[PDB]
Design a binder for this molecule. Structure first.
Ligand SMILES: OCc1ccccc1N1CCOCC1
Length: 284
């Protein structure tokens, strides 16, 4: 069923809450035993948001390999994403270790450091060229190379140096800065523009490790980003773009990380973004 018609039918009936609860009821439940070990309590931002054991990212160290991060592998679309929480004061070094080990080219940030008067994630990147950051626990150095501030997002160029081998790589930081403190954006236009800027960079392409995506918990805004990208790619690949079922794509992604899309309003916004984005994908 053409999703644009499914959309108007849900909106006219006002059943968004009912569709959303059906997804929550059918979603996968897999063990998260490593996340719940007592040694890992200060590595989790939220007690109710954990990576599944089967899909968690492992840090390459014998001490403790744990980070709150999952690999979302979309077989038909041929795209992979790492979804992670906003880093904590004691996990900023683990975060950059993961970027290094997984060979990622891009980091996508969908939140502000402070929202609603509270801290949603650590200040994990340098704000001035001449004041670099050293992570002594993981032996990495991070330098700000350049910054491009636009109305809806900021793009930064950073140098990550493995202090053990003196190898260096260029990481691009894509920072969406205008998601509102409450609700979802009224139009998906600036979110779609942002997505196409990340695509243009090469950050989502198979020649690099998976993109790292985060918000505060790494399930809500983060879920919206990967769901929209995968649905638009499937609409370009298939003989019938009308066959793409956004609810079925979301349940596939929920096999790899719990809780993706946190509200009925985020589900409606995801539909709006895919419907409006398709009017480029189909030749405009
Ligand atoms: O590509 C140039 C560059 C721009 C910005 C930040 C880092 C880098 N590099 C990556 C490869 O060479 C070593 C540092």
């Amino acid at each position: 069923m053409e999703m644009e018609k499914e959309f108007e039918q849900i909106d006219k009936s006002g059943s968004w809450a009912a569709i959303y609860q059906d997804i929550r009821h059918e979603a996968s439940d897999f063990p998260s035993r490593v996340a719940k070990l007592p040694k890992n309590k200060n590595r989790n931002r939220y007690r109710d948001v954990s990576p599944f054991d089967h899909s968690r990212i492992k840090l390459h160290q014998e001490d403790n390999d744990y980070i709150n991060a999952s690999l979302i592998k979309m077989e038909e679309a041929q795209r992979s994403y790492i979804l992670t929480q906003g880093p904590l004061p004691n996990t900023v070094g683990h975060f950059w270790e993961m970027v290094w080990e997984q060979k990622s080219r891009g980091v996508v940030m969908l939140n502000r450091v402070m929202e609603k008067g509270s801290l949603k994630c650590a200040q994990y990147w340098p704000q001035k060229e001449e004041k670099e950051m050293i992570f002594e626990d993981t032996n990495l150095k991070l330098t700000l190379i350049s910054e491009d501030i636009k109305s809806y997002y900021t793009v930064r160029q950073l140098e990550l140096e493995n202090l053990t081998t003196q190898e260096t790589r260029e990481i691009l930081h894509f920072h969406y800065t205008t998601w509102p403190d409450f609700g979802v954006p009224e139009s998906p236009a600036s979110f779609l523009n942002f997505l196409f800027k990340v695509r243009e960079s090469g950050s989502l392409s198979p020649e690099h490790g998976p993109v790292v995506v985060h918000c505060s918990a790494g399930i809500g805004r983060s879920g919206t980003f990967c769901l929209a990208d995968t649905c638009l790619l499937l609409m370009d690949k298939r003989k019938d773009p009308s066959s793409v079922d956004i609810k079925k794509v979301l349940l596939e992604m929920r096999k790899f990380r719990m809780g993706l899309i946190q509200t009925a309003d985020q589900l409606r916004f995801s539909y709006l973004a895919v419907i409006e984005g398709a009017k480029f994908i189909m030749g405009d």
